[PDB]
Amino acid sequence: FRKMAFPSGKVEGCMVQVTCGTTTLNGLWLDDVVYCPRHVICTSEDMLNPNYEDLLIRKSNHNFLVQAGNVQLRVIGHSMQNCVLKLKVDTANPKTPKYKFVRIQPGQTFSVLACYNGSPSGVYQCAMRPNFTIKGSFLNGSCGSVGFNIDYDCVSFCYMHHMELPTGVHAGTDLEGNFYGPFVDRQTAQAAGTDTTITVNVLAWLYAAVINGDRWFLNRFTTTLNDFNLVAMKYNYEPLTQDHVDILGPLSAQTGIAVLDMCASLKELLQNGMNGRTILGSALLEDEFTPFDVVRQ
Amino acid sequence: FRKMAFPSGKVEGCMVQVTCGTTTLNGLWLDDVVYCPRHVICTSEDMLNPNYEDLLIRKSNHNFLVQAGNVQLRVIGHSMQNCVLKLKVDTANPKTPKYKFVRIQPGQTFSVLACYNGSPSGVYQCAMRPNFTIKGSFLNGSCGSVGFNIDYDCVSFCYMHHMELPTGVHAGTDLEGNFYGPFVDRQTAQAAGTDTTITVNVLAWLYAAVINGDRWFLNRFTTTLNDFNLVAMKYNYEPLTQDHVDILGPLSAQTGIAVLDMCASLKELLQNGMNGRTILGSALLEDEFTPFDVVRQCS
Numbered sequence: 001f002r003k004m005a006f007p008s009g010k011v012e013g014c015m016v017q018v019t020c021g022t023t024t025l026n027g028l029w030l031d032d033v034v035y036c037p038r039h040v041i042c043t044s045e046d047m048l049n050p051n052y053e054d055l056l057i058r059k060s061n062h063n064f065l066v067q068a069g070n071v072q073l074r075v076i077g078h079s080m081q082n083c084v085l086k087l088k089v090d091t092a093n094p095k096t097p098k099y100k101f102v103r104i105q106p107g108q109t110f111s112v113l114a115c116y117n118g119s120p121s122g123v124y125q126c127a128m129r130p131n132f133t134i135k136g137s138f139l140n141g142s143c144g145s146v147g148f149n150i151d152y153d154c155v156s157f158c159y160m161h162h163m164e165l166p167t168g169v170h171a172g173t174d175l176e177g178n179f180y181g182p183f184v185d186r187q188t189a190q191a192a193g194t195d196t197t198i199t200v201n202v203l204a205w206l207y208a209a210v211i212n213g214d215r216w217f218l219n220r221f222t223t224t225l226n227d228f229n230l231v232a233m234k235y236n237y238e239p240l241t242q243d244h245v246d247i248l249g250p251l252s253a254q255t256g257i258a259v260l261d262m263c264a265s266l267k268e269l270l271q272n273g274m275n276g277r278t279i280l281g282s283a284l285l286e287d288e289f290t291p292f293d294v295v296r297q
Numbered sequence: 298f299r300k301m302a303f304p305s306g307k308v309e310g311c312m313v314q315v316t317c318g319t320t321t322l323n324g325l326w327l328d329d330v331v332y333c334p335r336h337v338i339c340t341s342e343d344m345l346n347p348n349y350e351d352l353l354i355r356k357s358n359h360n361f362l363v364q365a366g367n368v369q370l371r372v373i374g375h376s377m378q379n380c381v382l383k384l385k386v387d388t389a390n391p392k393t394p395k396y397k398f399v400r401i402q403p404g405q406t407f408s409v410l411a412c413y414n415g416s417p418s419g420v421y422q423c424a425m426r427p428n429f430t431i432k433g434s435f436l437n438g439s440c441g442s443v444g445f446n447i448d449y450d451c452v453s454f455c456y457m458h459h460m461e462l463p464t465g466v467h468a469g470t471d472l473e474g475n476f477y478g479p480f481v482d483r484q485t486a487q488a489a490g491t492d493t494t495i496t497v498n499v500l501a502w503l504y505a506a507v508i509n510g511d512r513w514f515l516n517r518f519t520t521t522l523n524d525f526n527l528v529a530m531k532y533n534y535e536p537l538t539q540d541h542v543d544i545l546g547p548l549s550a551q552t553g554i555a556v557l558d559m560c561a562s563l564k565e566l567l568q569n570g571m572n573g574r575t576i577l578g579s580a581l582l583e584d585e586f587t588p589f590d591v592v593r594q595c596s
């Protein structure tokens with residue numbers, strides 16, 4: 001049971017290159033609008049305390065170079081929504097999928113299409129951490145890469161990439177340009193809040209290990225919801241809500257293990273450890289699989 | 298480090314479904330040919346030991362339902378190459394990428410586009426184990442899903458999925474229909490060789506740790522390749538080949554650490570263990586990142 005991303009084809013058909021001055025990053029081309037991080041308009045001087053409204057009014061349409069492969073698109077208008085720049089182009093993208101813009105909740109997962117110079121490079125599954133960072137593979141030039149989920153024929157865009165933090169995690173915005181977390185698109189070293197582990201996902205992953213015939217960590221003991229949550233919070237795990245319990249039902253039924261029985265197992269793991277053992281190959285409890293992710297696979 | 302897959306769009310554009318009677322699996326549409334597992338022509342009663350040659354003589358072009366989405370593709374010829382069926386169709390796929398058929402080596406990694414009834418479900422990275430199995434997420438109806446790598450804009454197809462083993466791992470063929478490993482496409486119990494650790498990938502991981510400034514495990518000594526291989530076998534590590542030594546070339550050059558010196562460091566980890574330490578934030582050595590994978594995510 002391994003990490004699985006959504007097929008990326010519908011998003012690849014939307015990726016373009018956006019250049020301003022010496023700065024090049026990725027944009028998302030939907031209908032006749034290209035969305036990208038606004039810091040593309042910055043220079044080295046600008047980056048430490050950029051007054052974006054000032055920097056933007058000083059720009060004209062012709063200062064933006066948008067390339068779809070070898071083809072230049074003509075920018076006929078530009079505006080800013082929070083931290084995203086929107087470039088109107090004279091051409092519509094025929095490859096535009098059915099889509100929506102969503103803001104995801106912490107603990108939810110999405111796929112990331114990592115792009116450089118407008119070209120797709122890799123795809124992988126991320127979780128929005130409780131402290132609103134994401135543990136990604138993003139290098140120089142990845143800005144403007146997007147995260148998404150696919151439901152039926154519909155792409156829900158939830159993330160656009162903007163920056164790295166000193167710890168090596170990453171930060172960005174929704175497609176309305178609002179950051180996830182307390183971060184700012186300026187060139188400073190920023191720390192996040194204290195991270196916590198996503199408990200409902202750890203429980204989904206234990207159920208997955210059981211479904212894969214793997215149960216050394218199970219026990220006959222049980223716990224109340226509140227007593228589990230006391231121990232969880234002691235270990236900087238998120239408390240488990242009753243909707244979380246509800247959401248775990250299908251995995252509960254399928255294995256015949258009551259949610260609160262699995263909570264008692266997790267409690268024992270937190271207090272004791274894995275004592276050399278592994279679960280699904282891992283020496284660590286994994287919290288980037290949602291119940292939905294587990295079920296569908 | 299993440300398991301990271303290649304963007305799947307160029308492969309999505311080639312996926313179709315192939316049906317015989319009520320048996321539907323996936324196929325791969327490139328130019329005017331559709332490639333799929335030959336056991337699409339089997340009923341339940343034929344699967345324990347199909348006579349594939351006899352089953353095929355009974356088939357005509359008009360017995361094959363090939364669909365891209367809900368749109369039928371007319372079949373105008375059929376043949377069998379090893380364990381794959383090749384169906385000539387009357388339309389060249391307009392989304393055919395530049396492509397190659399490659400046969401990979403154990404330890405190499407590839408992306409799998411998991412498909413059901415010709416529709417993509419997900420993409421993920423797999424390593425081919427030294428016993429020629431992969432640990433995928435393959436459910437009923439995933440046969441004919443393919444594995445691939447993408448170089449420049451050329452898709453190298455390396456795997457087509459055919460079966461599951463009793464232990465829960467998976468087996469399949471290259472796109473010329475030749476199985477990886479000692480397996481056959483019959484619904485019988487077959488056992489894989491005991492698996493081993495992919496030494497070349499562990500070495501790549503150690504190089505990755507050095508590139509990131511985590512280098513406590515480097516020592517002042519070296520080893521011969523044969524001495525290393527004889528020790529490695531005692532810890533259920535795969536022996537290194539000359540190709541393994543060569544594909545470590547770039548990382549050795551990037552770090553200035555000779556391949557055989559890194560082998561001497563690995564030998565020490567094998568014999569003494571980690572003694573409470575971690576590498577890249579893990580007490581376990583990772584063996585599913587190739588030297589190519591490491592360079593992609595570092596540089």
Ligand SMILES: *[C@H](O)[C@H](C[C@@H]1CCNC1=O)NC(=O)[C@H](CC(C)C)NC(=O)OC[C@H]1C[C@H]2CC[C@@H]1C2
Nearest residue numbers: 138139140141142143162163164165166185186187
């Ligand atoms: C846009 O492509 C990049 C993506 C970064 C670069 C390295 N890895 C990434 O994910 N974003 C930036 O360049 C960004 C620009 C500012 C104006 C929002 N700055 C940034 O990521 O700085 C990272 C700095 C901060 C401390 C951690 C690493 C260095 C020092």
Ligand SMILES: *[C@H](O)[C@H](C[C@@H]1CCNC1=O)NC(=O)[C@H](CC(C)C)NC(=O)OC[C@H]1C[C@H]2CC[C@@H]1C2
Nearest residue numbers: 336435436437438439440459460461482483484485
């Ligand atoms: C084609 O979609 C399926 C994919 C299988 C089914 C579940 N997981 C998979 O990888 N392949 C088969 O159905 C295959 C057909 C024969 C002709 C090769 N049979 C198969 O994989 O069965 C494996 C045997 C071995 C023991 C496990 C299940 C049975 C008994």
